[model samples]
Target chain A: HDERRRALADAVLALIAREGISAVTTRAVAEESGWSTGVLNHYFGSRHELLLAALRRAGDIQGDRYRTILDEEGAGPIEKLRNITASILPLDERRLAMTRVFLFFYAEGAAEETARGEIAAFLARWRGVVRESVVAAQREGTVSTDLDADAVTVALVALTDGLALQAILDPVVMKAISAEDAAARCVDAAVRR
Target chain B: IVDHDERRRALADAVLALIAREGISAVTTRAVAEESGWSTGVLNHYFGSRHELLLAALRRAGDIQGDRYRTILDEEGAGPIEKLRNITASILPLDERRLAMTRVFLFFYAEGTARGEIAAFLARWRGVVRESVVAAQREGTVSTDLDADAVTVALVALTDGLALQAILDPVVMKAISAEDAAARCVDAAVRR
Candidate 1:
């Protein structure tokens, strides 16, 4: 049953990637998953419920990946921060699809209470991790003490998100600048003496 | 008659206001017509479809924002760095009106990924920022060693990202003003 739910969520995300959020109708998801509309109805109460579930599934998967990066052994604070930030950038087709879905969730947040809560929670967790890494870097004297850890974290997140938007929207232009390079620059800007 | 153009503009303004008050999903022929104090027939006459109405509102927003950029760039006696700062600050949603514009802009960009005109508008807007970065670099205000496109991307990203942050988490993000954040980004790209 859980596997069935995950499959349905994956189908919804695939629809979001192939088209846009606007294309994710219940019938579309049913067709994409090769499941009957009755099955979809049985598993998901409504279109809104299905959307929320898909968003949560995506967030959970992404959150796990980010956690694994942070938990890597023998990695220093700066390396960990760099790797985590790089993970969010839409460097490949798969990641870009993820970003499209993420943006879809952001748009949904405008009109839905559950989406708003989920997005806010996810962002808070993302910021918390970055802030922790920044503070750790500061304690190690690798980052500038003059800089506020919170501010640096916020700026870094902004830069990552900004790059993600451009990379997704204008891949040809972003091709000249790699996500790793951009992330390194943002981190350097924050830590520059 | 010229009244036709005035009615069109008024309807577009109504669509924008609905988007600001509610979300983009709130936009419909009936909703827009009611918002504009007109009839659905009039909306359909001006914009044949909901898609066309959205495009008009998006274009209107781009025009308003694009004009601001032009005005800032044309300001006499303002150095390249100051002009760059002004252009970046203008993109930030510092107030209610600008915030509404930001929401509309993001909505259009998302929908515009497959839309040629909307995509072109955004690309052109980014080009404007890129041009300013190059101009500042030529004036020695920004470092020639820095990659002009990279800096432009950074600035654009920061502007959009900061706007999202401000809209989503105003209280936490209020500590750093948009102008101050823009200045920092500029300084980072400039030769110290």
Candidate 2:
């Protein structure tokens, strides 16, 4: 039953990744997942619930990726930071879809009352990881102590989001370099001595 | 005669206000007309279609922001690096009105992805920034060794990124002012 629920949420995310947020209607999700509207309603209860689930799932996917980077043996703080930041950029189709879904959530959060709480929690979690990583780097002497970890974390998050938007919208100008290259340059500019 | 332009401008401001108060989704012909304290008929007469009205509002907002950038660049006695910093600061939303404008800007960027106009505007804006960075490098205010295009990308990314962050998390993320953040970006890129 939980597996089926996850499948339904994945279908909604696929729709959001491919189409924009406007495409994520109940009927749409039902069609995309090959499940009947009744089945979807039985599992998720409402369109809002389905979207919230997809969002949480997306956050989990992202968090798991971050943990994998952090857990790599012998990887220093700077390398982990670089990989973590690079992971957010839409380097390929899959990541691009994730980026679209992320932005879609932000737009929904701005407009809808129901979405605001979940979006805030999601953002806080993401921000916390970046902040913790920055502090770790500072302690490792890989990043400059002169920079405030909190400020740098905020700045890095902003840069990640901004660049993601650009990469999605204006790929020609923004994607002149690969996402990893851009991410590395930004991280270096922020931390390197 | 001038009243026509003034009324149109007033309507555009109304569109911006609606976008700021409500998200862009709340904007409709009737809503904008009502927000402007005019009739829908009057709005249609001034701006033909709903699409035209929205685009005009975006262009007008861009013009207002561009004028501020020009003012910062033209400020007397400020060096190149200082002027660059000021220009970046102006791009960020440090106050309420600007914050609204930033939201509106992002909304348009999302909407404008297929429209082409906003993308062109962004390209032009980045070009202007790149030119400024190169000029600063020539004047020895910025490091010539740094890649001008790369620095421009970083600064532009930082500006938009910071704006989005502050907009979403106003209280918790408000510690770093836009001016301070912009200054830090410039300092990182400047010659030692």
Candidate 3:
């Protein structure tokens, strides 16, 4: 059952990745999934529910992806922090496309109260991990202890969010520059004692 | 030619004032004509098309903003960092008029997927921001290690995101003024 659900979720993500979020309608997903629209209703109910499921699934995958990277042994705190921070950058085609889809959901979700709660919760989880990493770096005496870890975490999140938004909105500029480069510059500037 | 020029200027001002009072959606040919107390035929007579009117309005707004930046530079020697902050924050909607203009920009941006013209305009806007980042770096105000292109892109994104958030969600707002936010964010990224 879970596997079937995962398949549906993957199909939804692929549709969003290929087409923009506006393309994610019942008919669209049904066509993408090769399943009837009734199947979506059975599995996920309405379009909103399917969207919520997609967001939840993305949060799970994102967590797993970063955890795998962070859990590796022998990496220094700064290195780990950099790796985690850089992970958010849509440096590659796959990541960039994924971010574009995600941001579409995020922006649209803002107006929908039901979706907004889930989006905010997901952001909090992401930010919590970032804040924890910052605290860890401070404990290891890598980052400035005087700096507020929470604030820095929020700022970095903002910075990365800003980078992704710009990259999506203007790929021409992003092609010349990049989100990862920007994130690294930010980390380098912030890591002083 | 003089009459044509005066009519064009009036239409551009009318567009800006309409965009300032209402959102960008309000700037239709009919609306512009009504706002200017002219007939729809007048707009068609001058601009010839709605696209031309929008382009003229955006160009005029950009020119006005460019002049304002020059005025700021003429008065004070507030350093490259300060100038960059001022220039970037000016993109935000601080007052009612600015807010309306921002809404216009956002509407066009939101529809950018379908509007190649607006998308091209946005691309050009990012280029201007990129140039400023280079200028800041040359002035020794920005970090050398940072990529000028990346920093500029990031700055543009941050300003837009901060502005959008300020408009959409007022609760999680940062207390720092838009200028301060830009200054501190840029300062934090730059090498001291």
The candidate maximizing TM-score is: 2
Worst 10 residues of 3 chain B by lDDT: B170-179
lDDT of 3 at A18: 73
| Full candidate order by TM-score, most accurate first | 2, 1, 3
What local lDDT does model 1 show for residue A161?
Answer: 78
| lDDT on C-alpha atoms for all candidate structures | 0.73, 0.72, 0.64
TM-score of chain A, all candidates: 0.85, 0.85, 0.83
Candidate achieving higher TM-score, 1 or 3: 1
Clash count, candidate 1: 0
Root-mean-square deviation (CA) per prediction: 3.2, 3.1, 5.0
Where does candidate 2 stray beyond 4 Å? Answer: A19-28, A44-50, A177-180, B1-4, B21-31, B46-52, B112-114, B171-173, B176-179, B189-192
Indicate whether candidate 1 or candidate 3 has the larger DockQ. Answer: 1
Error of 2 at B35 (Å): 3.9
Interface RMSD of each: 2.5, 2.8, 3.8
Error of 1 at A174 (Å): 4.3
Model 2 clash pairs? none
Q: Give candidate 3's root-mean-square deviation (CA, Å).
A: 5.0
User: Model 2, range A1-193, lDDT digits (tens) per residue?
Assistant: 8888888878887887787667889899989999999888788877768777787777778888988988999988777778888888877645666777666666665566566566667667777877777899888777788888876776677777778877778766456537446667767766534
Q: Write one digit per residue (lDDT tens) for candidate 3, span B20-126.
A: 77645467899998888889887887777776776667656655665666665565666666666776667666765456555555544543433554465456555
